[PDB]
From a paper:
Mitochondrial fatty acid synthesis (mtFAS) is essential for respiratory function. The last step of mtFAS is carried out by 2E-enoyl-ACP thioester reductases MECR and Etr1 in human and yeast, respectively. These enzymes are members of the medium-chain dehydrogenase / reductase (MDR) superfamily, catalyzing the NADPH-dependent reduction of 2E-enoyl thioesters into acyl thioesters.
G165Q variant did not provide crystals under conditions previously used in MECR crystallization, so completely new crystallization parameters were screened. Both wild-type and the G165Q MECR formed hexagonal crystals at +4 °C in a condition where the main precipitation agents were PEG 6000 and NaCl and the pH was 4.5 as described in Material and Methods. Crystal structures were solved at 1.85 Å and 2.02 Å resolution, respectively, in the trigonal space group P3121. The asymmetric unit contains one MECR chain, but the enzyme forms a dimer via a crystallographic 2-fold axis. In the MECR structures presented here, the first N-terminal residues (residues A31-A41) are not defined by the electron density maps, but the C-terminus (till L374) including the six residue long His-tag sequence is seen well. Otherwise, the current and previous wild-type structures are very similar (RMSD 0.70 Å for 332 aligned residues). There are some small differences in certain loop regions such as 240-252. In the current structure this region has high B factors, but residues are still well defined by the electron density maps. In the wild-type MECR, the substrate binding cavity can accommodate fatty acyl substrate longer than C8.
Residue numbers in the entry:
A (entry chain A), B (entry chain A): 42 to 381
Write the structure that this text describes.
């Protein structure tokens, strides 16, 4: 009776993902039966399906790496999860775009159920990525600056909020658009100090434009090409640019002068590798940290369009969009307002 | 009575460098009068004159940053240099392409005069750069591998020798040429384990071609563009590519997959900054290290064309060449064999 979004081959998700009926496994001693409640469509999910990603589950595969589920049944040896608990995947690759599944308890992390459901559904990827990038590369103190691009993305909005919660001052690059003023005010209300366009970023002058803030030692990039070079250019001598997303045909470009004379560092960050390298308990501590930020009103989930699993086609469609209408989240529960 | 190579404006060294007659300063309390013996033409010297470099001495300026000189006279307060001592600049910017000069003793580092003159003349830049890059980024142990490009360059040959002296195993990329076999044997006799072309490097297969050696954790780059990407591709997960030279129009290009999934690091190295950041004593210790490698027969100076200061025009000409005939060194002493 399980309904799932399964791809049999790599390609355009719009074309290769289909809604199939699977049957449930048996609940072994250390297994957990879950009912998925919600699961976002994230760039990494799209890349997995397209076949350009560092982790590519065996085909045919279930789409999605992130989501929150409710524990329904547990195996005879399990003492640390109970019916009713909320859980999220311990790492990528699990396949979250479905109604029900049976997972080893070690594959799951309990999340408090007092936070909003949509927050739990999106806690495990974007906020974790943001927090990790802010902590793991440069030691930042209150008053220090951070610059990033794609600032309106899931990670970008989480960086704004978490950076603000850390007392950091953000310069947030976005793409040029007609409703820039509205976007700017919105990001500022999440805590952004300044919001600038890629066009502004490219100006020679702009490097020393915001006189009343320190040069950033950390830059967060997911765009690449010339844009990534312009982000680099904004760094203080010895600073680091961390790349956490992008495209195959838009490599990161670093001028020889910036590497040599400005002693800049280029790094990557991959949350799945972090999770692989660390214990479930260490990931749980990160989750609890973020849960506290949520309860303290220091982190809130972005604007989301809830789409029933059945209408997944339109949800995929929307997340492909260059200027993404609004984040898409697949929901397996009926809400107070029906969505046809 | 001083003869010097002086540029009044930035441009093609072939065009903007001229041989002028200067007069000597007075020897103050902490000053030293030196007679230059030899000075190489290095890429950094060319970049200074072209006006694309991180350090650009005030114009009109004397060409050259490297050389060895003999101390002739010293100021009344100097107790640590004596007539007859060999000296080299403590850092870049000094102006070494001339017959005589007066320098603050703090601007100079004594070098033992038991090593060959041409070695002393070239010790301060290329071997230092090689050694520093091998030590300062990845902790390499005997048996570990290093990959580099422009392996036939001054730095490249020094890396081969110093890496060999450290018990490291080198993969040495060079440009495709008709006399590749000869070049390969030559680099192997300096200690290179393998010598491959840029063409070979670009082959997908070649990444796991040398079965009997470990993947390198360190890559040394001075080429940029696609070549730099192909060098990166050879690194072990978590490895570092250090860039120490290149051109403005050939930035380093790093694919998103390599940064993210392979967790590669890109860095720069600038010897002048190292020297600025460290004490003269720390630079002297590096020099003594390299002097020991020389006396131990573990480091030898590359093949050099000695050119009198007067014939500097042809020396500049030769060092511009894409495939540099052979390294050019300006000499201020007559040798056993006259050079018209
Ligand atoms: Cl952007
Ligand atoms: Cl602003
Ligand atoms: Cl680093
Ligand atoms: Cl993940
Ligand atoms: Cl090469
Ligand atoms: Cl070989
Ligand atoms: Cl130097």
């Amino acid at each position: 009776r399980v309904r799932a979004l399964v791809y049999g081959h790599h390609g355009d998700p719009a074309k290769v993902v289909e809604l199939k009926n699977l049957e449930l496994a048996a609940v072994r001693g250390s297994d957990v039966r879950v009912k998925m409640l919600a699961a976002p469509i994230n760039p990494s999910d799209i890349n997995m399906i397209q076949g350009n990603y560092g982790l590519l589950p065996e085909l045919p595969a279930v789409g999605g790496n992130e989501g929150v589920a409710q524990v329904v049944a547990v195996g005879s040896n399990v003492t640390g999860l109970k019916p009713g608990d909320w859980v999220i995947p311990a790492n990528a690759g699990l396949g979250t775009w479905r109604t029900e599944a049976v997972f080893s308890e070690e594959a799951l992390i309990q999340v408090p159920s007092d936070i909003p459901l949509q927050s739990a559904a999106t806690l495990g990827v974007n906020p974790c990525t943001a927090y990790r990038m802010l902590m793991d590369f440069e030691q930042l103190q209150p008053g220090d600056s951070v610059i990033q691009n794609a600032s309106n993305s899931g990670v970008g909005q989480a960086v704004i909020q978490i950076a603000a919660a850390l007392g950091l001052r953000t310069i947030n690059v976005v793409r040029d658009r007609p409703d820039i003023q509205k976007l700017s005010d919105r990001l500022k209300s999440l805590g952004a100090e300044h919001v600038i366009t890629e066009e502004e970023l490219r100006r020679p002058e702009m490097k020393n434009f915001f006189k009343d803030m320190p040069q950033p030692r950390l830059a967060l990039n997911c765009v690449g090409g010339k844009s990534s070079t312009e982000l680099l250019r904004q760094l203080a001598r010895g600073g680091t640019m961390v790349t956490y997303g992008g495209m195959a045909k838009q490599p990161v470009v670093a001028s020889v002068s910036l590497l040599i004379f400005k002693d800049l560092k280029l790094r990557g960050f991959w949350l799945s590798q972090w999770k692989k390298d660390h214990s479930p308990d260490q990931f749980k501590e990160l989750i609890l940290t973020l849960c506290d930020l949520i309860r303290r009103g220091q982190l809130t989930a972005p604007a989301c369009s809830q789409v029933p699993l059945q209408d997944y086609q339109s949800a995929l469609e929307a997340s492909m969009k260059p200027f993404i209408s609004s984040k898409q989240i697949l929901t397996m529960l009926e809400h107070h307002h029906h969505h046809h």
